[PDB]
Amino acid sequence: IDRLITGRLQSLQTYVTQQLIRAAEIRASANLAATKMSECVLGQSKRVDF
Amino acid sequence: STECSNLLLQYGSFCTQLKRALTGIAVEQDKNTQEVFAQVKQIYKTPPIK
């Protein structure tokens, strides 16, 4: 049972770390989308290819 | 080692997801280089009179 507990705890830790990294990437993309909402829809931007 | 491989098969699919993460990093690097450098549609050339 100690061996099985160690294995399942390792798998859960790996899943939590992968979820944290994916959440950071999703937060960066959401901040970019919020900037595009504030600058392209609520105004007119002079930035090239933005 | 055959005995080590037979004991390693009991540990599950840790290495499949490690290979998946490394493959994701590998395709992400090429995505980054393509996104930075390949922004022009045509390959322009300078006229020979400098």
From Swiss-Prot, chain B:
What is the protein's known function?
Precursor of the fusion protein processed in the biosynthesis of the S protein and the formation of virus particle. Mediates fusion of the virion and cellular membranes by functioning as a class I viral fusion protein. Contains two viral fusion peptides that are unmasked after cleavage. The S2/S2' cleavage occurs during virus entry at the cell membrane by host TMPRSS2 or during endocytosis by host CSTL.
What name does the UniProt record give this protein? Answer: Spike protein S2
Q: Which organism is it from?
A: Severe acute respiratory syndrome coronavirus 2
Q: What is the lineage of its organism?
A: Viruses, Riboviria, Orthornavirae, Pisuviricota, Pisoniviricetes
